[PDB]
């Protein structure tokens, strides 16, 4: 199917407690594959998936150089942003950046990204054209002017249409055992009385990969998404994910209700019911 590669970066200033902490992770789809933390002893980018371990010493060296350079750039950006927002040097602030690419089943570029948040709010983003920017405010407009003058988008475009796609293709082949395997959910339905006249039906999905899934409850065929409690999809810690969906129903009307499960790993979508 379709795939993505994303690099995530967070810098968090901590006045009086040294330089900002910098943490960056790389993903292919929902699989973590590299990490760098500036607070590690003598920090290096480290592998986190088996299929990247085969990259040579030169790969780790270049990646490590890039991570350290990005940390320094983000330190300068954080000092810049204090100026742009007229802020004191006393508080902790946060700079986030995600960049990467989406590709289709045929490996062709679907979309590229390069976007930033300051203190949890949109700051600047590369538009889908990979040629222009959206600035969230007058501060980000200053960055936009600078990056336009420097033709920074041209460099981003070349990377996103070239190396981003090409290296994603390489990782997908090298990791084809896992990255190109969808593990279906293991499912069941639990029943919990609330009161004399109501009960909770909970539909469970466990052990699935990737995280994309649809869990819905129907009453005699009618979607009940208005009344369905859907927890956030959560990591199991072994690459897989978990999720549940619950509906409160009238006692003795449980057989009206079906849970419907759609996932890439399933031979067919499931229709489940409470089985006494």
């Amino acid at each position: 199917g379709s795939h993505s590669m994303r690099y995530f970066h967070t810098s968090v200033s901590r006045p009086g407690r040294g330089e900002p902490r910098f943490i960056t992770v790389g993903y292919v789809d929902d699989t973590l594959f590299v990490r760098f933390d500036s607070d590690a002893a003598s920090p290096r980018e480290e592998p986190r998936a088996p299929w990247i371990e085969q990259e040579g010493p030169e790969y780790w060296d270049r990646e490590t150089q890039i991570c350290k350079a990005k940390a320094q750039t983000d330190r300068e950006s954080l000092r810049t942003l204090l100026r742009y927002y007229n802020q004191s040097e006393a508080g902790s602030h946060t700079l986030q950046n995600m960049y990467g690419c989406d590709v289709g089943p045929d490996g062709r570029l679907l979309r590229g990204y390069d976007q930033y948040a300051y203190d949890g709010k949109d700051y600047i983003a590369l538009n889908e054209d990979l040629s222009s920017w959206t600035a969230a405010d007058t501060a980000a407009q200053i960055t936009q002017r600078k990056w336009e003058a420097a033709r920074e988008a041209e460099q981003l475009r070349a990377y996103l249409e070239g190396e981003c796609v090409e290296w994603l293709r390489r990782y997908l082949e090298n990791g084809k055992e896992t990255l190109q395997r969808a593990d279906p959910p293991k499912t069941h339905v639990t029943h919990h009385p609330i009161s004399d006249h109501e009960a909770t039906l909970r539909c469970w999905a466990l052990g699935f990969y990737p995280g994309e899934i649809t869990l819905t409850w129907q009453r005699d065929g009618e979607d009940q998404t208005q009344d369905t409690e859907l927890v956030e999809t959560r990591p199991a810690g072994d690459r897989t994910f978990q999720k549940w969906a619950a509906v409160v129903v009238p006692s003795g009307e449980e057989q009206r209700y079906t849970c419907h499960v759609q996932h890439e790993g399933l031979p067919k979508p499931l229709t489940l019911r409470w089985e006494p």
Binding site: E76, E152, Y159
Partner: peptide, 9 residues
């Protein structure tokens, strides 16, 4: 792999 170049804000 990561992009080599960038610029500060």
């Amino acid at each position: 792999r990561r992009k080599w170049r960038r610029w500060h804000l």
